[PDB]
Structure formats: C-alpha cells, structure tokens
Amino acid sequence: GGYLVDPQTSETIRGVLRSTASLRQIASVVNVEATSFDVLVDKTDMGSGWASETAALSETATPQIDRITIPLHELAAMPKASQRLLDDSAFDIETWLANRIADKFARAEAAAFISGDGVDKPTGFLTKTKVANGAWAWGSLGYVATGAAGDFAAVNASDAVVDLVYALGAEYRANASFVMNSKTAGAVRKMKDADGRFLWAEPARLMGYPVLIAEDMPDIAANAYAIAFGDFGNGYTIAERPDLRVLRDPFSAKPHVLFYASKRVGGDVSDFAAIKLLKFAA
Amino acid sequence: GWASETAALSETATPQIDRITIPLHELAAMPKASQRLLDDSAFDIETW
C-alpha cells in the first residue's frame, strides 16, 4: 500500500527568484505608442537684467533646445512548448510563461537601461562618452576619478564618494540614487576607519541617499565606471508600450506551441548633468 | 533577443523545472497520565 499515497504537488509552480532591480522604478517611465520618443531639453538658459530706471532694456538670451531621440526598440523571447504538455499539466502553463517571460524581460532590459549599447537595444548611461567632471560638456556624462587604479583612494579613502555627491548639482541631489552591482556594494561597505570599524552606517541607503543595487555595472577594475549616482527622474527616460503581447504559434513547430511574445522598449540619457560617475583611473 | 528588423527570430531557451518532494513526516509524543489525577486536580489537565 505504498502506491495509495499519491504525493500532492504544489499549488503554484515556483521558480528561482532573480533580481527585479531594473532601474525602471527609479527612471522616468513614459508610455509611448509610436516608433520613437523625442525629449526636448534645454542646454542653456536666459539672462536677467536688473534694469535701471533709465536703461532702455535690450535683448537677452534664450535657451537653445536640444532633442534626443529615443529609438524604442523591440524585445522578444520565444520558447518552444509541446502541445502534449499544455493539455495535461494542470498548472496553467500559458499564464506561467507569461508571468515568467515578463520577469526575464524586466531582467533583460535592466542591462539595456544601464549597460546596453546602441544597436537594437537602448544605450544605458554607461556607454555615453564619459567626460571627467569640471570640463562638463553637454553631450556627455560627467565623472569624477578616484586616484589609485584598482581600488579607492589610499591615503584619504572614501573622499572620492563624497565629492561625487557634491558635484551632482544642488537641484539633482534632491531625489537621487546610487547605482552599483551587489559585489561592489560589499567593497564599499568593507571600508573601515583606522580602528577596524567600518564607517558607513532595506533601502540600503548610503549617506542617506537611496541605493539601487543593479546587476550590470563592472566591479573595481583599472578603468571601470563602477559606481553611478544622480537624479534618474530627469536623467534617464524609458519609453515603452505598457503590455506584453503574446502570439502563440501552433503551426511552425507542428507538435509544439511555440510562444512568441514581445514587448518593445527604448530609452537613453535625458539630462547629462543629472548623472555623475566614478572612474578608478587617476 | 533584441531582434533586429530583419532577423527572422529563432528559438530561445526555456527554464528546466526541478521538483523537490517534501516528505511530510509525523511527530508524536505520548505522556502517561493517571485517571485519579485527571478527576481531582481542578486545573484542566487535558487542555494543559
């Protein structure tokens, strides 16, 4: 009578639970049903007078306007599922895959929003013609450097972070966020004083400011840009369609169902001063 | 994918699924209580 016990299975098919930290909840999500998106930002500003009583006030400047075009790519994944499985496996496999394909997409475009390159996918802010801060141009992101190559500063450590903060602009620092991968945030937290006590004290905020633990930036290398910071509410624009359109394909793979689903998304940097970076070169 | 405009998109992987079976054992304890105690000890020994 050991064949009478028929082990009860789960109610919900579970899975490994991967990092949903995707910068989407901190960037500027924009609904768009089009081929592209065009932010219209202002690279300069006007001038003011303090006009005297007898001045006959003359002209002043006017903010010249810079367009950045969002490409708004598409993203698709296509699993091959057997028709025999989909009829006899009482867990609802169709809505399981659409619940799982979406979690891959929000995990796939996190690399696009941060370390994505140009072709067929959004450029994350890491590949945007980095310029050291102080000679800050428009069409480029600023960064500060640390000093020593493969680590933080040696003599006065932990000062390359605080000036990265205080070079981000006083308006942008109001609601900003650090961005690191989870293996750099250890090497930040492992920093300690001369006494052996580590100095930095859920949101895992750092110096009060929130930290988004991404999973895409490089670690402490020779010339890597490992630590990001800035106001992503104005700095980065995400353009997308707010649906996950699924097309099941009963015909091509004949004994199979072949789910083809695609949500389409794009977005690159929006305000070049609203993000500062950290180089480890010099 | 990040499929291009002219790509003719091919197959992709699919999460292979691993079952772990819970054994769901039983656990019992069996004290021996005297009938004389259970009738004269006004603290409710059964629910205690």
């Binding site: 699993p79 496999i93 | 699919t14 699924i17």
Partner: peptide, 9 residues
C-alpha cells in the same frame, strides 16, 4: 515548457 518525455523540462 518543452517536451513531456524527459522530466526536468
């Protein structure tokens, strides 16, 4: 997922 033949898929 894939085929019903091998279990792990």
């Amino acid at each position: 997922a894939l085929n019903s033949a091998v279990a792990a898929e």
